[PDB]
């Protein structure tokens, strides 16, 4: 808002590095990029309580400079490997209660803290992905009694540590932190890389983000965060919100897949996992042009309390899987209370499966899943309009759908029961 990088020796528009200048202004105050074009040699390390707005940021780093080399911001910098060695204290906690007991804590009122379960899986980073994760602010302390600004929503045994734990480093030996109460407004990003890679946010707002990147909404530990009016041409992954993202809302989002710069290796549509809670996507388009093929457009694995609403999907390929809820069991928190509502799906090909529900294991948990107002425009699916698969002992139960498919399609069930699926033809 108030200060310019120019005031800290920053030069725009000539392809010289300004990262230090931007970071210097961020330390002093809010930052207005003057509607000019800034060039950075590495991600801007963000500052809690700051607004950055009104300009374009391009990376100077060469494609394949290494992970996060091309990134625009480190809005926080959590990655499971750097969170893993942080010492974490045992605490008592009760499902529904904002009160914990922690022997020999050093939390003060106002401190952001991270609550996590000791239950979890070893994930892609070869480290614990807790069954449950929560950032919350301390609002009271008396001896071992700590009060939080939000309840604990699990019966799981938790441990706690300072969200920003002094002495502990992350990538490029920068301190491990969560970005608090920061705002990003009217920014154009221009990178080959994740415009954010490592990240962790709490009460942050991204408003008016446009341009080109590997990704549209991608990062770790997005908490009490809003993403609004995001319109990005992406080359690999529409959205992942990993490592315990919760109470985070995406609205007015245009995921435009990049035909020229498409990277087909490990392509991801919207893929939500790593114990997310109360994450919503509302009013969005996923546009996959000719020449680009995403195998799975929207999938939820390891997310709960999810709402995906007011969606348009257009793909220019065949045999895509459109909407998917999956659970691989073990110590993955259940895929519970998932609403897909008012999704129009166009395919120039013929979808494989439009609605999929898949329990891989005897201990897989999928409950209170609804697919309401799903319109599929395209040829009769090659596998199924709608497929449910459980196991003999672990059936898919209670699933609900309203589907509008002018070319109909197969209704495949395999160890599933107690569904309620209305099919409507065109013309009301």
Residue numbers in the entry: 27 to 454
From the paper:
Surprisingly, we collected diffraction data at 2.0 Å resolution, which produced a unit cell and space group (a = 38.3, b = 141.0, c = 81.9; β = 102.6, space group P21) not compatible with the size of the protein. Therefore, it appeared obvious that KP34gp57 had encountered some proteolytic degradation prior to crystallization. Only upon experimental structure determination using SAD did electron density maps clearly reveal two copies of the portion 27–454 in the unit cell, i.e., missing the C-terminal domain. The N-terminal region of each copy (residues 27–56) contains two α-helices, followed by the typical β-helix structure characterizing the catalytic domain of tailspikes (residues 57–102 and 204–454). In addition, a six-stranded β-barrel domain protrudes from the catalytic β-helix between residues 103–203. This crystal structure content was fully unexpected since monomeric tailspikes have hitherto never been observed and their trimeric state is believed to be crucial for enzyme stability. Indeed, we identified a large cavity in each promoter (with an area of 280.9 Å2 and a volume of 330.5 Å3), formed by both the β-helix and the β-barrel insertion domain, using the software CASTp. A clear electron density describes the catalytic pocket, thus allowing for the identification of E266 and E300 (belonging to the β-helix structure) as the most promising catalytic residues and D151 (belonging to the insertion domain) as likely assisting CPS binding. After incubation of CPS with the enzyme variants, the absorption of all samples was analyzed at 490 nm and compared with a calibration curve measured with known concentrations of glucose. This assay confirmed the crucial role of E266 and E300 in catalysis since E266Q/E300Q is fully inactive. In KP34gp57, the high resistance of this CBM to proteolysis, together with the observation of the monomeric state of KP34gp57 once deprived of the CBM, suggests that the CBM domain plays a crucial role in inducing a compact trimerization of the enzyme while still allowing for the necessary flexibility needed by the catalytic domain for enzymatic catalysis.
